[PDB]
Write an enzyme that holds these catalytic residues in place. Structure first.
Site, PDB file in Angstrom:
ATOM      1  N   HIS A   1       0.842  -1.187   0.000  1.00  0.00           N
ATOM      2  CA  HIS A   1       0.000   0.000   0.000  1.00  0.00           C
ATOM      3  C   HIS A   1       0.880   1.239   0.000  1.00  0.00           C
ATOM      4  O   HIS A   1       2.078   1.163   0.284  1.00  0.00           O
ATOM      5  CB  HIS A   1      -0.860   0.022   1.261  1.00  0.00           C
ATOM      6  CG  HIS A   1      -0.064  -0.023   2.524  1.00  0.00           C
ATOM      7  ND1 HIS A   1       0.735   1.024   2.943  1.00  0.00           N
ATOM      8  CD2 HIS A   1       0.075  -0.994   3.459  1.00  0.00           C
ATOM      9  CE1 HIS A   1       1.322   0.700   4.079  1.00  0.00           C
ATOM     10  NE2 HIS A   1       0.939  -0.518   4.415  1.00  0.00           N
TER      11      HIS A   1
ATOM     12  N   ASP B   1       4.765  -4.990   3.907  1.00  0.00           N
ATOM     13  CA  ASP B   1       6.224  -5.047   3.966  1.00  0.00           C
ATOM     14  C   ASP B   1       6.725  -6.387   4.523  1.00  0.00           C
ATOM     15  O   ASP B   1       7.715  -6.958   4.020  1.00  0.00           O
ATOM     16  CB  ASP B   1       6.799  -3.860   4.752  1.00  0.00           C
ATOM     17  CG  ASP B   1       6.068  -3.601   6.060  1.00  0.00           C
ATOM     18  OD1 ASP B   1       5.333  -4.496   6.527  1.00  0.00           O
ATOM     19  OD2 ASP B   1       6.238  -2.495   6.625  1.00  0.00           O
TER      20      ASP B   1
END
Length: 369
Positions: free
Chosen positions: A18, A285
């Site tokens: 994102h 991540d």
């Protein structure tokens, strides 16, 4: 030598993180950067209507993912900066797969594209922004984003759901910030920045805040900005300590099922009406780090906001051989097991199978008995 002009693009898969957001939690000090809710306003260029279902599906699941921070903005929220990053990613995709070659329709076609995201709102909005950029807000049919319940979710390592994974990483997770050289640097940073020893802080929180503030060009503490690179490096070191490349079982349990999804998509090409040209996955991540490691492409940088890993599948028109080409953040990669950037599909799948985990094998490996 292969002539690329005889290569025909078949399937594209893009996994992405994102866009820029507000930090999950703020730093413990009296003076913090102001996060203004004005950053939440949607750029009109990014507006694309969409609906959300489960993998079935089927009703959309409930989302467990509360903290308001200085300026009034909520934590972990996608800002217009992030929306623009994602839109830009979508436009790069359009450049590649629409304009330069007519692989995808210039307007969104529900049967050309499969879309999955984690059930978190910033990922959903990031997806909308990417779509907006890729299709220029044109659709021939409704956009459907598929998600799963948090407990079943494979788009990030799931510790809560996978017991063995949790057990294998728990000790190292406890001691991660106590490791030699990580600990000294942590103390040094807390000291130089005047953070108390009585506040519990690690490189994850530090990196979260420095990266969030840098992404927004905020008036950050100059010392925080000065430590930005070492902070990122030590966050990476912490993450790798908890889950090192050498621990195969853990990697398998962490990204294994996700890899299995990507592989399955590659295999659909071997064999009609259910065929998608583009698969999108909104992820995190913590997905990217082990993912990249198993592919042998990790660059030892925290995966950036709006970073994407793009997988292209080609078939040679003469030999009818298949090849995979892998890009990370727009840069061509050479995954391990591959002779070069254009990797024979068989070698690629053989390499990926080291870490790949089917749902059955995952469930087995994860369970206490």
């Amino acid at each position: 030598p292969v002539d690329r002009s005889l290569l025909k693009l078949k399937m594209v898969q893009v996994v992405f993180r994102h866009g820029a957001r507000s930090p999950l939690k703020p730093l413990p000090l009296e003076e913090q950067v102001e996060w203004n809710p004005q950053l939440l306003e949607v750029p009109p260029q990014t507006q694309f209507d969409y609906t959300v279902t489960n993998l079935a599906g089927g009703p959309k699941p409930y989302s467990p993912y509360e903290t308001t921070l200085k300026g009034g903005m909520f934590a972990g929220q996608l800002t217009k900066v992030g929306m623009q990053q994602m839109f830009a990613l979508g436009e790069r995709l359009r450049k590649n797969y629409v304009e330069d070659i007519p692989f995808l329709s210039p307007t969104f076609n529900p049967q050309e594209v499969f879309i999955r995201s984690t059930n978190i709102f910033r990922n959903l909005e990031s997806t909308r922004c990417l779509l907006a950029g890729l299709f220029q807000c044109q659709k021939e049919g409704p956009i459907i984003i598929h998600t799963d319940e948090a407990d079943s979710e494979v788009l990030y390592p799931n510790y809560q759901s996978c017991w063995s994974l949790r057990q294998r990483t728990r000790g190292r997770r406890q001691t991660a910030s106590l490791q030699p050289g990580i600990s000294e640097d942590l103390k040094k940073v807390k000291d130089r920045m005047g953070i108390d020893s009585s506040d519990k802080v690690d490189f994850f929180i530090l990196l979260d805040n420095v990266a969030a503030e840098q992404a927004h060009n905020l008036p950050s503490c100059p010392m925080l900005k000065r430590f930005a690179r070492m902070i990122e490096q030590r966050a990476v070191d912490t993450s790798l300590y908890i889950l090192p490349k050498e621990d195969r079982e853990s990697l398998q349990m962490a990204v294994g099922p996700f890899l299995h999804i990507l592989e399955s998509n590659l295999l659909k090409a071997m064999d009609p009406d259910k065929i998608r040209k583009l698969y999108l996955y909104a992820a995190h991540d913590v997905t990217f780090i082990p993912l990249l490691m198993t592919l042998g492409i990790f660059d030892h940088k925290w995966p950036p906001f709006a970073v994407d890993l793009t997988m292209e599948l080609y078939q040679h028109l003469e030999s009818k051989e298949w090849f995979v080409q892998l890009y990370y953040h727009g840069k061509e990669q050479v995954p391990r097991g591959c002779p070069d950037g254009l990797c024979p599909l068989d070698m690629f799948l053989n390499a990926m199978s080291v870490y790949t985990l089917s749902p059955e094998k995952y469930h087995a490996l994860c369970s206490q008995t």
